[PDB]
Design a protein around this motif. Structure first.
Motif, PDB file in Angstrom:
ATOM      1  N   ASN B 261       5.625   8.033   5.676  1.00 54.42           N
ATOM      2  CA  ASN B 261       7.432   8.177   5.067  1.00 54.42           C
ATOM      3  C   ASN B 261       8.047   7.583   4.871  1.00 54.42           C
ATOM      4  O   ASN B 261       8.721   6.809   3.933  1.00 54.42           O
ATOM      5  CB  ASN B 261       7.848   9.687   5.911  1.00 54.42           C
ATOM      6  N   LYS B 262       7.877   6.114   5.853  1.00 54.96           N
ATOM      7  CA  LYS B 262       8.599   5.043   5.533  1.00 54.96           C
ATOM      8  C   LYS B 262       8.231   3.850   5.061  1.00 54.96           C
ATOM      9  O   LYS B 262       8.348   2.833   3.970  1.00 54.96           O
ATOM     10  CB  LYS B 262       8.610   4.568   7.352  1.00 54.96           C
ATOM     11  N   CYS B 263       6.641   3.561   5.301  1.00 60.50           N
ATOM     12  CA  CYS B 263       6.034   1.927   4.642  1.00 60.50           C
ATOM     13  C   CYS B 263       5.560   2.768   2.981  1.00 60.50           C
ATOM     14  O   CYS B 263       4.022   2.393   3.336  1.00 60.50           O
ATOM     15  CB  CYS B 263       4.866   1.734   5.063  1.00 60.50           C
ATOM     16  N   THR B 264       5.330   2.435   1.694  1.00 62.72           N
ATOM     17  CA  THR B 264       5.887   2.835   0.812  1.00 62.72           C
ATOM     18  C   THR B 264       5.482   1.874  -0.253  1.00 62.72           C
ATOM     19  O   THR B 264       4.597   1.294  -1.534  1.00 62.72           O
ATOM     20  CB  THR B 264       6.660   3.816  -0.478  1.00 62.72           C
ATOM     21  N   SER B 265       5.792   0.431   0.470  1.00 55.72           N
ATOM     22  CA  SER B 265       5.684  -0.715  -0.340  1.00 55.72           C
ATOM     23  C   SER B 265       4.341  -1.503   0.401  1.00 55.72           C
ATOM     24  O   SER B 265       4.454  -1.577   1.606  1.00 55.72           O
ATOM     25  CB  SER B 265       6.382  -1.596  -0.684  1.00 55.72           C
ATOM     26  N   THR B 274       6.285 -10.402  -1.269  1.00 54.26           N
ATOM     27  CA  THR B 274       5.266 -10.673  -2.694  1.00 54.26           C
ATOM     28  C   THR B 274       4.311  -8.691  -2.909  1.00 54.26           C
ATOM     29  O   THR B 274       3.506  -8.517  -2.398  1.00 54.26           O
ATOM     30  CB  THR B 274       4.530 -11.587  -3.086  1.00 54.26           C
ATOM     31  N   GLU B 275       4.699  -8.020  -3.635  1.00 55.35           N
ATOM     32  CA  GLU B 275       4.435  -6.788  -3.942  1.00 55.35           C
ATOM     33  C   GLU B 275       3.211  -6.930  -4.207  1.00 55.35           C
ATOM     34  O   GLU B 275       3.007  -7.318  -5.380  1.00 55.35           O
ATOM     35  CB  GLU B 275       5.801  -6.147  -4.155  1.00 55.35           C
ATOM     36  N   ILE B 276       2.293  -6.248  -3.851  1.00 60.37           N
ATOM     37  CA  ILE B 276       1.013  -5.908  -4.666  1.00 60.37           C
ATOM     38  C   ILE B 276       0.416  -5.041  -5.159  1.00 60.37           C
ATOM     39  O   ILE B 276       0.071  -4.134  -5.898  1.00 60.37           O
ATOM     40  CB  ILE B 276      -0.468  -6.282  -3.438  1.00 60.37           C
ATOM     41  N   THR B 277       1.112  -3.637  -4.425  1.00 58.66           N
ATOM     42  CA  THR B 277       1.127  -2.513  -4.203  1.00 58.66           C
ATOM     43  C   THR B 277       1.739  -1.381  -3.674  1.00 58.66           C
ATOM     44  O   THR B 277       2.792  -1.645  -2.663  1.00 58.66           O
ATOM     45  CB  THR B 277      -0.636  -1.848  -4.758  1.00 58.66           C
ATOM     46  N   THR B 278       2.027   0.062  -3.941  1.00 64.79           N
ATOM     47  CA  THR B 278       3.247   0.923  -3.857  1.00 64.79           C
ATOM     48  C   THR B 278       2.282   2.078  -3.172  1.00 64.79           C
ATOM     49  O   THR B 278       0.725   2.518  -3.690  1.00 64.79           O
ATOM     50  CB  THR B 278       3.855   0.829  -4.849  1.00 64.79           C
ATOM     51  N   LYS B 279       2.302   2.656  -2.444  1.00 64.76           N
ATOM     52  CA  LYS B 279       1.898   4.216  -2.110  1.00 64.76           C
ATOM     53  C   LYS B 279       1.535   5.037  -3.390  1.00 64.76           C
ATOM     54  O   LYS B 279       0.629   5.495  -3.071  1.00 64.76           O
ATOM     55  CB  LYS B 279       2.457   5.343  -1.178  1.00 64.76           C
ATOM     56  N   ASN B 280       2.065   5.300  -3.744  1.00 58.51           N
ATOM     57  CA  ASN B 280       1.854   5.755  -5.601  1.00 58.51           C
ATOM     58  C   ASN B 280       0.276   5.688  -6.115  1.00 58.51           C
ATOM     59  O   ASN B 280       0.045   5.686  -6.795  1.00 58.51           O
ATOM     60  CB  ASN B 280       3.315   5.696  -6.492  1.00 58.51           C
ATOM     61  N   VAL B 307      -6.841   1.381  -4.699  1.00 60.04           N
ATOM     62  CA  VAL B 307      -5.631   2.018  -5.715  1.00 60.04           C
ATOM     63  C   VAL B 307      -5.571   1.959  -7.579  1.00 60.04           C
ATOM     64  O   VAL B 307      -6.595   0.971  -7.406  1.00 60.04           O
ATOM     65  CB  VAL B 307      -4.432   1.162  -5.219  1.00 60.04           C
ATOM     66  N   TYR B 308      -5.250   2.696  -7.561  1.00 59.98           N
ATOM     67  CA  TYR B 308      -5.382   2.093  -9.363  1.00 59.98           C
ATOM     68  C   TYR B 308      -4.706   1.373 -10.609  1.00 59.98           C
ATOM     69  O   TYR B 308      -5.303   0.645 -10.910  1.00 59.98           O
ATOM     70  CB  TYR B 308      -4.342   3.702  -9.665  1.00 59.98           C
TER      71      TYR B 308
END
Ligand SMILES: Nc1cccc2c1CN([C@H]1CCC(=O)NC1=O)C2=O
Ligand code: NA
Ligand SMILES: [Zn+2]
Lengths: 1099, 378
Positions: B261-265, B274-280, B307-308
């Protein structure tokens, strides 16, 4: 601390089982009741029930069935405990000696096995060939009932059906045959199996029925001639046999979930059925062979029934877990079939919360329509027989106006400047006049005196009156016509006080002669002969001392200075068990009791007690052949003596100003009591017992707090309401809908939450505040905060929605109860559930979801967050001591925090994760924490290098056998401290600390007592007390079983000597020596005085 | 949509080569018992019970240790290193070899194994011998709890504890109302008990597993389900060692649900921000889930999350199918554009008819789960 003593203050009251049969003899009809760890045995009589025997078992009773093997003269009893201890019991009576003997016993737990979803089921076939037990999925345990099977040796038979709901043995079959309901992917079904005795396997049963009702849950085996089975579900009742099938789905059971039954007649024509809400039904099997139909009749309402048992004479025992148990009469031509309650049996369970008043226990008991408060106090009750509206009574005296009768027939009452006389003829009281007595002066004393005479001492004079011709014969007055201030008298002596001066007169035929005169503040006097008294007790104003003067010389034998400014109000010389004492009550409610010598006249040993805040008045009265003292004040007390030691018991009554014993024809061995408005005639109970007042609420009490400044209790409650068609409506009136005043914050069931304000004296629901729709009230405190002098009721809530698993909203509401209403002073929105709250050094500490938050109460009357601690657990439990905070979750994760005043934040001190269900927690001291955990255990953890300092050590484990909902520090009556606990079964217990030396002695004593105490079912005490879960067992540690220790007092003298033979007694010096039976007797008697005593069951 | 890609292929580890000998025997050590178990020296991964671990061993002391292990109980110890440089670990998991193959072509000895996590343990002491370490360990029990209601359950309602089969929001409302009815005998409400109920927690987790894997085939036992989920969560070593320390399936499920629920990034660990991907973007290219352990040609294990789409990555080298963990795809090294840290690889389909045409395989050790603007919650 690390060594704890646990003892029962109130045995479990909830009923988990009830059976009838012929157990005590073939000719008696018995009623057997299981109350968790206790078994009650009654004889059913025309009047009701006669209690004959009660026993405790070292186990939680899970199965209780009577049965009669071939060759047995009367029924035997089968018991299975929750720890799988099985036994067959026999009642043995010889004269007045009653023993429950163990015919057979054994533990039937399997090494492996998955305990079934629908629990332990134990059944016995009609022919008594076997006991069948369904303990685990996929297995049916068979214990052959052969004479030689004394170890209850068993075999398992594989059951292909892994999800069995209920099972019974059928009647009228050639071989033992089981009938059960089971569930599988294709639905819910009924099946039968024959038990092959030779093969020890199932054979195909005589019949089955696939796809029965989705909610079929109860199997009933119908006896011969019809046989077969009745299956009860949510909406239908079906009958099945080899070919026959009957089905009914009556509207009368639409709103019911039927969960208990009992057969009324031996041929099975009628059954009683109970639902989850108190409805009682009769199921009738109609014949025409043959069985033609089924019919259900609604009989009426009982307590919510856990179990039912028809007795005889149309009487049914209703065993309740959620409310009081009952005896009901099925009256059910002119009317339909219906039931009427005849008798009620107290059930305190479930105790969901509780609080202590003074330094009484008040519980939140029951659930739903059975919800109540129970007000519990120990003391001596008074059975009131008469009441007279006569205000302003200043004194009471019994009198025998007839010299040829030994019984009292007159009550003389004094008033301010007045005296009245009441005559007694049976229970008829009639005010009269007494020739010789004046009615225009206040009486200080009157009664029967020597030479067949009566005396009346007033402020004006001492009047002597003859019995046969009622007339004044001699009158004594002060030489200067001054008023008498204090008066004392016996059969032959009169000692009056005129301010500082004193006068001693003697009673002779037709004469009162003045013998002595001495100036002393005078406050009180006494001349009780311990029949001429040679001594005179006195109280003074200037020195505030109690002096024992001589008679007739008035020489001071002893002077005892009490000290302080409160003047003494009452003095008395009385004897308890041949030992002489001198009691002295002060104007502040203090009682100074001293030993006295009838010859020397000195204070042997001096002790002081507190018997109220109002001045105390002492009066002698006789109970049995002994003498007792009634102490009148705000808390009336009966002073008595056990083993040459004074014992002060409470009287179960409000303020009693005056009392006198009264022994009349209509009221033998009675008493007369007076308060400011009423005269009461009553009879004192022979011995002390728990007095419980029930306050029905007809809804669920959840939390309770006492608010002393407002003389009320705050109670969180909930009631169930249903979605009405003309849109919710309540199912019945209850406390929250019947309050004197009310306030609001703004077919499925909804819970409506409320804060009740309940008067502490009348128990009237003064106010009910209804919370928001979908708002759940969780926590409640009554406290003062910050510098605000007001005391508030504070409630922590959660907003509950079915679509959201985790609470995201809630509030803390601060209420003030002033005048007759509840005002909302302030509220604080939080983003979660306020599971717990505690007042913490003038601040409000709250646990919201996984956080612990501290609030300050400001002069603007708002809660302001000081600091917030994020935990990795839900902060469900919250307890505090000083600046320390104990946090706990449902899984026994324990956390210790310290508030740091110089940092304005929390610091985590220690923690422990040991996953298990935890139901309650409490701080014993700075280093020790007590909890209740699965299954029915207690634990103690202690705080002991950073890793070592942060580690909580397990120091105590004990299988209690009860489920604790609440712990609270409190005194009701090595040992140190007092932590009380309330449970689901209504049992109340006490945990107290011991030193290591006392623990070692009592632990040794337990091991020795276990070798002499006969255990019902031959269960070992160590096995019973071992910390228990389904998967593991560990020996108990750091806990002494007070119930076992106290049983030492009931064993024979030789067995007491055997128990103490190798005990090393320590009398406080380390120099240990052999303990004697008399040493342990006084130690164990002292231990019994720390909690309320248990009532004797049988006459 | 996955088209012309057999999702059963990644878990077979076909890149390890020809068929391996299988072993079916099972060794389980008693709860709280003390055992001495060998540690493979170069293994650095944190093993979860039930999780597969492929290995390629080239050193003769590793080869002889595994050869001797096969003769015995086939169990080794996988340490969850607190400090990987100082080789210190307080906890770990046993790994039981279930598949083995020895290569001796050209005189070069290589041992390929597939092991599975079995039991958790606390390290009592670590002693180094042939170069192989022997850990003295204490077996940590799996804490199995009954239902919260099992102690408080009224016997009259025992017969109502089996409900009709689940066909629904209304079914779960009825489940809570019936299963937790005896909450009214206790200090707490039914909705609080649901927060500690294994079936309810597993159902809430399954909703999020459906978002990752659209195509149930999941364990019914909460122990196995909680371990299957634990091995899929792309969390850093600190969080994973905390999750491995949990002894209860209920606490393990609660903790996994809270992270999900919390860690979506998912950010670059070296960079932190630096963001690489997300839960989505998470999906399951393997039937085991979105992340699994794979072994590279040098014996190094990478837990690779599929990840897509991934962002802020630079591509170095030319696509290669050599030793590819996803047959039919070529890999290219992907570095964080800011710090140049190796985050994983971009995988590109070698055939036009495959779906997806591309995805990213990100290594667990290079990621930092982030709560966009981490307290492990039991
Ligand atoms: N060739 C080479 C050299 C050093 C490290 C590595 C490789 C290839 N590899 C990965 C690349 C991605 C894959 O699907 N399989 C692998 O084996 C490594 O991690
Ligand atoms: Na398992
Ligand atoms: Zn980076």
């Amino acid at each position: 601390m690390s060594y704890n003593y646990v003892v029962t203050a109130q045995k479990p009251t909830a009923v988990n089982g009830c059976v009838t049969g012929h157990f005590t003899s073939a000719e008696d009809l018995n009623l057997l009741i299981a109350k968790n760890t206790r078994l009650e045995i009654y004889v059913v009589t025309a009047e009701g029930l006669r209690p004959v025997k009660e026993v405790g078992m070292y186990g939680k009773i899970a199965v209780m069935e009577l049965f009669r093997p071939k060759g047995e003269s009367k029924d035997l009893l089968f018991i299975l405990t929750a720890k799988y201890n099985a036994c067959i019991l026999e009642y043995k009576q010889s004269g007045e000696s009653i023993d429950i003997i163990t015919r057979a016993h054994g533990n039937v737990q399997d090494r492996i096995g998955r305990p079934s979803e629908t629990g332990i089921i134990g059944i016995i076939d009609p022919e008594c060939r076997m006991i069948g037990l369904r303990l685990y999925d996929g297995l049916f345990k068979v214990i052959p009932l052969d004479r030689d099977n004394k170890e209850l040796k068993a075999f398992n038979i594989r059951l292909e059906e892994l999800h069995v709901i209920d099972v019974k043995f059928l009647y009228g079959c050639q071989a033992p045959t089981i009938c059960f309901v089971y569930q599988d992917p294709q639905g819910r079904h009924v099946k039968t199996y024959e038990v092959s005795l030779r093969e020890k396997e199932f054979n195909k049963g005589p019949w089955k029925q696939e796809n029965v009702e989705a909610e079929a849950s109860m199997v009933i085996a119908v006896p011969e001639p019809f046989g077969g089975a009745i299956i009860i579900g949510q909406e239908s009742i079906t009958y099945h046999n080899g070919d026959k099938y009957l089905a009914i789905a009556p509207p009368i059971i639409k709103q019911s979930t039927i969960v208990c039954h009992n057969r009324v007649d031996p041929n099975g024509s009628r059954y009683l059925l109970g639902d989850m809400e108190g409805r009682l039904f009769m199921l009738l099997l109609e014949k025409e062979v043959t069985l033609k139909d089924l019919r259900v009749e609604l009989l009426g309402e009982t307590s919510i029934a856990e179990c039912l048992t028809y007795l005889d004479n149309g009487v049914v025992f209703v065993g309740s877990r959620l409310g009081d148990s009952q005896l009901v009469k099925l009256n059910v031509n002119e009317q339909g079939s219906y039931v009427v309650a005849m008798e009620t049996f107290t059930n305190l369970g479930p105790i969901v919360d509780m609080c202590v008043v003074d330094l009484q226990l008040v519980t939140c008991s029951g659930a739903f329509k059975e919800g109540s408060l129970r007000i519990i106090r120990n003391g001596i009750g008074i059975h009131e027989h008469a009441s007279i509206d006569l205000p302003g009574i200043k004194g009471l005296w019994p009198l025998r106006s007839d010299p040829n009768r030994e019984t009292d027939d007159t009550l003389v009452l004094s008033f301010v400047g007045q005296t009245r006389v009441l005559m007694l003829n049976g229970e008829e009281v009639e005010e009269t006049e007494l020739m010789g007595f004046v009615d225009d002066q206040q009486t200080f004393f009157c009664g029967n005196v020597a030479h067949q005479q009566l005396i009346q001492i007033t402020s004006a004079s001492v009047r002597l009156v003859s019995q046969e011709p009622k007339a004044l014969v001699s009158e004594w007055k002060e030489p200067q016509a001054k008023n008498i201030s204090v008066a004392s008298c016996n059969s032959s002596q009169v000692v009056v006080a005129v301010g500082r001066a004193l006068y001693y007169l003697q009673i002779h035929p037709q004469e009162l002669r003045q013998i002595s005169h001495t100036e002393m503040e005078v406050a009180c006097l006494d001349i009780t002969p311990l029949g001429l008294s040679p001594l005179c007790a006195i109280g003074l104003w200037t020195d505030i001392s109690a002096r024992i003067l001589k008679l007739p010389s008035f020489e001071l034998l002893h002077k005892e200075m009490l000290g302080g400014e409160i003047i003494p109000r009452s003095i008395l010389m009385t004897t308890f068990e041949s030992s002489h004492y001198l009691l002295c009550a002060l104007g502040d409610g203090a009682l100074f009791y001293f030993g006295l010598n009838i010859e020397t006249g000195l204070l042997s040993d001096r002790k002081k007690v507190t018997l109220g805040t109002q001045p105390t008045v002492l009066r002698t009265f006789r109970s049995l052949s002994t003498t007792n003292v009634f102490a009148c004040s705000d808390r009336p007390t009966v002073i008595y003596s056990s083993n040459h030691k004074l014992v002060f018991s409470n009287v179960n009554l409000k303020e009693v100003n005056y009392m006198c014993p009264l022994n009349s024809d209509g009221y033998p061995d009675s008493l007369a009591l007076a308060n400011n408005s009423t005269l009461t005639i009553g009879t004192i109970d022979e011995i002390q017992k728990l007095h419980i007042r029930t306050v029905p609420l007809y809804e669920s009490p959840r939390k309770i707090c006492y608010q002393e400044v407002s003389q009320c209790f705050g109670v969180l409650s909930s009631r169930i309401e249903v979605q009405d068609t003309s849109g919710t409506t309540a199912l019945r009136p209850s406390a929250s809908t019947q309050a004197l005043s009310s306030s609001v914050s703004s077919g499925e069931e909804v819970e409506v939450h409320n804060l009740l304000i309940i008067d502490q004296h009348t128990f009237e629901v003064l106010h009910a505040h209804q919370f928001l729709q979908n708002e759940y009230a969780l926590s409640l405190v009554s406290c003062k905060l910050g510098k605000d002098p007001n005391t508030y009721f504070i409630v922590g809530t959660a907003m509950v929605y079915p679509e959201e698993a985790e609470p995201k909203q809630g509030r803390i509401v601060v209420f003030q109860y002033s005048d007759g209403k509840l005002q909302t002073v302030a509220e604080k929105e939080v983003k979660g559930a306020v599971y717990s709250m505690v007042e913490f050094n003038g601040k409000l500490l709250a646990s919201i979801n996984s956080t612990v938050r501290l609030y300050e109460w400001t002069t603007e009357k708002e809660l302001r967050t000081e600091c917030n601690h994020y935990n990795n657990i839900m902060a469900l439990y919250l307890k505090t001591k000083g600046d320390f905070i104990l946090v706990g979750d449902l899984m026994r994760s324990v956390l210790l925090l310290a508030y740091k005043p110089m940092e304005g934040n929390f610091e985590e001190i220690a923690r422990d994760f040991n996953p298990n269900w935890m139901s309650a927690v409490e701080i014993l001291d700075d280093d020790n924490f007590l909890g209740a955990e699965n299954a029915f255990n207690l634990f103690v953890c202690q705080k002991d290098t950073d890793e070592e300092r942060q580690h909580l050590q397990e120091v105590g484990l004990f299988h209690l056998g009860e489920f604790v909902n609440v712990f609270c520090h409190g005194s009701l009556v090595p040992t140190q401290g007092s932590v009380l606990f309330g449970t689901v079964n209504g049992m109340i217990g006490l945990v107290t600390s011991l030193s290591e030396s006392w623990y070692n002695l009592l632990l040794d004593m337990q091991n020795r007592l276990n070798k002499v105490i006969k255990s019902v079912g031959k269960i070992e005490h160590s096995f019973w007390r071992s910390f228990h879960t389904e998967r593991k067992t560990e020996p108990a540690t750091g806990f002494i079983d007070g119930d076992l220790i106290e049983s030492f007092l009931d064993i024979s003298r030789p067995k007491m000597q055997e128990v103490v033979a190798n005990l090393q007694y320590d009398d406080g010096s380390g120099m240990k020596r052999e303990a004697t039976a008399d040493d342990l007797i006084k130690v164990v008697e002292e231990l019994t005085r720390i909690h309320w005593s248990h009532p004797q069951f049988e006459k | 949509n996955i088209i012309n890609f057999d999702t059963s292929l990644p878990t077979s580890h076909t890149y390890l080569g020809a068929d391996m000998e299988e072993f079916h025997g099972r060794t389980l050590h008693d709860d709280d018992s003390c055992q001495v178990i060998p540690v493979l020296p170069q293994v650095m991964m944190i093993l979860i019970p039930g999780q597969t671990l492929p290995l390629q061993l080239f050193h003769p002391q590793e080869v002889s240790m595994v050869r001797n292990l096969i003769q015995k109980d086939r169990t080794f110890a996988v340490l969850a290193y607190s400090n990987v440089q100082e080789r210190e670990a307080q906890f770990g998991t046993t790994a039981e070899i279930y598949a083995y193959r020895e290569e001796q072509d050209f005189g070069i000895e290589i041992v390929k194994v597939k092991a599975i996590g079995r039991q958790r343990f606390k390290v009592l002491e670590l002693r180094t011998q042939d170069g192989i370490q022997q850990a003295k360990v204490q077996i940590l029990p799996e804490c199995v709890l009954p239902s919260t209601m099992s102690a408080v359950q009224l016997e009259s309602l025992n017969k109502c504890q089996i409900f009709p089969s689940k066909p629904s929001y209304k079914w779960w409302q009825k489940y809570q109302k019936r299963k937790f009815h005896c909450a009214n005998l206790t200090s707490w409400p039914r909705w609080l008990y649901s927060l500690y109920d294994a079936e309810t927690l597993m159902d809430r987790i399954k909703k999020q597993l459906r978002e990752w894997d659209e195509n149930d085939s999941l364990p019914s036992n909460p122990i196995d389900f909680s371990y299957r989920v634990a091995a899929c969560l792309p969390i850093d070593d600190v969080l994973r060692i905390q999750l491995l320390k949990i002894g209860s399936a209920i606490q393990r499920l609660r903790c996994e649900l809270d992270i999900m629920n919390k860690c979506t990034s998912l950010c670059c660990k070296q960079c932190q921000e630096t963001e690489i991907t997300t839960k989505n973007e998470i999906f399951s290219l393997s039937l085991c889930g979105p992340m699994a352990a794979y072994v590279n040609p040098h014996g190094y294990v990478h837990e690779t999350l599929t990840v897509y789409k991934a962002c802020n990555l630079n591509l170095i080298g030319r696509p290669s199918t050599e030793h590819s963990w996803f047959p039919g795809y070529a890999w290219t090294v992907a570095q964080c554009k800011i710090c140049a840290s190796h985050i994983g690889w971009k995988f590109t389909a070698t055939k036009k008819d495959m779906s997806p045409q591309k995805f990213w395989g990100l290594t667990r050790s290079a990621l930092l789960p982030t709560i966009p603007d981490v307290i492990l919650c039991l």
